[PDB]
Amino acid sequence: MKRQNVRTLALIVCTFTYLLVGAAVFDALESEPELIERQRLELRQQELRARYNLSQGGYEELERVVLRLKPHKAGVQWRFAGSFYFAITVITTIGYGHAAPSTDGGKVFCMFYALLGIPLTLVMFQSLGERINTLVRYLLHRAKKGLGADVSMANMVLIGFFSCISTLCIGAAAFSHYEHWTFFQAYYYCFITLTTIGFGDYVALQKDQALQTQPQYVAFSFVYILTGLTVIGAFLNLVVLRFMTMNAEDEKRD
Amino acid sequence: MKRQNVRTLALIVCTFTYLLVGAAVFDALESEPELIERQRLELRQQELRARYNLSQGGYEELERVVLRLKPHKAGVQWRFAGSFYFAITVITTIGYGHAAPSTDGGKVFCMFYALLGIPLTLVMFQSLGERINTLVRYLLHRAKKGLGADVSMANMVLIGFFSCISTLCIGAAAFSHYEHWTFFQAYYYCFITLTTIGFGDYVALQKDQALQTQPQYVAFSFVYILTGLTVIGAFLNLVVLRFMTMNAEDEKRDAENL
Ligand SMILES: CC(C)CCC[C@@H](C)[C@H]1CC[C@H]2[C@@H]3CC=C4C[C@@H](OC(=O)CCC(=O)O)CC[C@]4(C)[C@H]3CC[C@]12C
Ligand SMILES: CC(C)CCC[C@@H](C)[C@H]1CC[C@H]2[C@@H]3CC=C4C[C@@H](OC(=O)CCC(=O)O)CC[C@]4(C)[C@H]3CC[C@]12C
Ligand SMILES: CC(C)CCC[C@@H](C)[C@H]1CC[C@H]2[C@@H]3CC=C4C[C@@H](OC(=O)CCC(=O)O)CC[C@]4(C)[C@H]3CC[C@]12C
Ligand SMILES: CC(C)CCC[C@@H](C)[C@H]1CC[C@H]2[C@@H]3CC=C4C[C@@H](OC(=O)CCC(=O)O)CC[C@]4(C)[C@H]3CC[C@]12C
Ligand SMILES: [K+]
Ligand SMILES: [K+]
Ligand SMILES: [K+]
Ligand SMILES: [K+]
C-alpha cells in the first residue's frame, strides 16, 4: 500500500475509534444525570399542573408560547448589533443558534453569505495568523540576541499553546464578570466559542438587553471573538496545517 | 509594504466590510418580522395567563420547567447513539447544542475531547478529501483517454461544485422525508450542517425517538454527515486551501531571493 493510502486509512480508523471511545465516556458521564433530571422535572411539572389547575392541553398551549418567546427573552436580536453578531457566527462557523433566520429570504441570503463568507474568513484568519507567528518568531529572535539566537519549532509550539491558554483565561475573567457566570462556565464558553463548536448553551450579549443598551461590552465581545480566533487560527497554522498538505506532497513525490 | 502585509490588510478590510454589508442585509430581512412576531407572542402570553388564572410569578415558575424539559422532549439524548451523535457534533465543530454536557465532568471531558479531536478530524477530512480528488482526477483521465487526456483545474472545480450540489440534494431528499420538513428546510439544514455552522434550529434524529427506535435512519445520518463533510472538505482542499499556504510562500521567496 502507498504511504497516502496507509495514512488516510489510519486516520479513518483513528477517528472512528475516537468516536466509539467518546460515545462510551459521554454515556458514562451523562446517561444517569439525564434520566435523574428527566424524572425530577416530570415530578416538578406534575406539581405545577396541579397547583394552578392545568390540564394536558392547557399545559401544551402554554408550552408553545414559552418556547417561542425564548429567542425574544434576550431582547431585539435582529437590529444592527444583533445582525452583526449573527454575521460573525455565520462566517466564523460558530453558529450558536441563539438567533437564526426566521424568514425564507433570510435563510437564502444566509446560505449565499456563508458560501463566500467562510472561505474569505478562513483565508483571512490563516493570513493574519501567519503574520502573528512571523512577528513572534522575530520578537523571540531579537530577545535571544538581546539577552545574550535561532527560533525552533518547539519554542513556537510552547508560545502558541500558552497564547491560547492566555486568551481563554483573559476571556473567562471578563465574561465571568459581565455575564455573571462562574470562571469555569465562562472558560467553557470561551473554549466552545474559539473552537467554532458554538453549542449555544452559553452566549454573550443576551443578559439585560446588552446588544441595545451596552455598546462598550458589545465592542469587547466582537474584538475578543475575532482576536481569539486568530490566536487559535495561528496555533492550527503552526501545528495542524502542515499535516493537511502532506497527503498532496507524497503524491507530488510519486 | 510587503506583498504579505498588503494581502493580510486587504483581507481584514474585506472581512469587516463583508460583516457590515451582511449586518445591513440581515437587518432589512429580519428586523420587522421579529418585531411583528414578538408583539404577536406578547399578546398570546397575556391571553393564556388570563385563561388559566396565572400571575407574573406563576408563569415564571412554569417558564423554567418548559425550558428545562426542551432537551428531554426529543427523548434520551445521552445513551450510545445519542453520545455518538454528540461526539460527531464536537470533533466536526458542528455543535448543534440540542444536547450539551449538563455535568461539570462532562464539560471538562468535552474540552479535552475537542482539543485532540478537532485536529484529528480536520486532518482526516483533508487526507480523505485529497484521495477522493486523486480518484476523480484518475477516473476523468481514464474517461478522456477511453472516449477518445490531461485533467485541468477548471474540470476539477466543475466536478467539485456539482459534487456539493448533488450531496445537499440527496440529503434534502432524505431529511425532508424522515424529518417531515420542506425540501428547502432540509436543504438549509444540510447546508448549515456540512459548513459546520450548526445553528441547531434544525436537528435530525429528534422526532419520534429516532435515536432509540430507528437504527437504520441513525446509521444513514452519521454516514451522510461524515461523507458530506468529506465532499465539502475536498472542495475546500481544491479551491480555498491553495491561498492559505500563499502567505508562507511569499515569506519563503523573500529569504531565498535575498
Ligand atoms: C492541541 C492540538 C492543536 C494538537 C493535536 C495533535 C495533532 C497534531 C495530532 C492528533 C491526531 C494526529 C494524527 C493521527 C494519525 C496519523 C496517521 C499517521 O500515519 C502513519 O503513521 C502511516 C503513514 C506514514 O507512515 O506516513 C501519520 C500522522 C497522523 C496524520 C497524525 C498527525 C498529528 C495529529 C493530527
Ligand atoms: C482589528 C480591530 C482591532 C479593529 C476592528 C474595528 C472595530 C473598532 C469595530 C469592528 C466592529 C465594530 C462594532 C460593530 C457593531 C456595533 C454595534 C453598534 O450598536 C448599535 O448600533 C446599537 C443599536 C442597534 O442594535 O442597531 C455600536 C458599535 C459596535 C459595537 C461596533 C464598535 C466598533 C467595532 C468593534
Ligand atoms: C465557493 C467557494 C469555495 C469559493 C469562494 C471564493 C474564494 C476563493 C475567495 C473569496 C475571497 C477571496 C480573497 C479576497 C481577497 C484577497 C486579497 C488579495 O490581495 C491582493 O490583491 C493584494 C496582494 C497581492 O497582490 O498579492 C489576494 C486574493 C485574496 C486572498 C482572495 C483569494 C480568494 C478568496 C478567498
Ligand atoms: C466508510 C463508512 C461508509 C463506514 C463507517 C462505519 C459505519 C458502518 C458505522 C460507523 C458509526 C456506526 C453507528 C454508530 C452508532 C450506532 C447506534 C446504535 O444504536 C444503539 O446502540 C441504540 C441504543 C442506544 O441509544 O444506546 C446502532 C448502530 C449505529 C447506528 C452504528 C451503525 C454503523 C455505523 C454507521
Ligand atoms: K449551535
Ligand atoms: K465550526
Ligand atoms: K454551532
Ligand atoms: K459550529
From Swiss-Prot, chain A:
Catalysed reaction equations from the record: K(+)(in) = K(+)(out); Na(+)(in) = Na(+)(out)
Tissue expression summary: Widespread expression in adult. Strongest expression in pancreas and placenta. Lower expression in brain, lung, prostate, heart, kidney, uterus, small intestine and colon.
GO molecular-function terms, A-Z: metal ion binding; monoatomic ion channel activity; open rectifier potassium channel activity; outward rectifier potassium channel activity; potassium channel activity; potassium ion leak channel activity; protein heterodimerization activity; S100 protein binding
Record note on what altering V218L does: In PPH4; loss of function
Residues binding K(+) 1, per UniProt: T93, I94, T196, I197
A GO BP annotation: monoatomic ion transmembrane transport
Top-level division of the source organism's lineage: Eukaryota
Result, substituting E251 to C/R: No effect on channel basal activity
Effect annotated for changing K252C: No effect on channel basal activity
Cytoplasmic side stretches: 1-8, 129-155
Mutagenesis / variant outcome for changing Q4C: Increases potassium current amplitude
TM region(s), chain numbering: 9-29, 108-128, 156-176, 220-240
Effect of H141Q: Does not affect channel potassium conductance
Free-text activity regulation comment from the record: Inhibited by external acidification, diacylglycerol and anandamide. Activated by halothane and isoflurane.
Result when mutating L238A: Increases potassium current amplitude
Region: Selectivity filter 2, residue numbers: 196-201
The keyword Glycoprotein appears for this protein: yes
Membrane-topology descriptor: Multi-pass membrane protein
Protein name: Potassium channel subfamily K member 3
Organism (species): Homo sapiens (Human)
Name of the gene this protein is made from: KCNK3
Boundaries of the shown chain within the full protein: 1 to 257 of 394
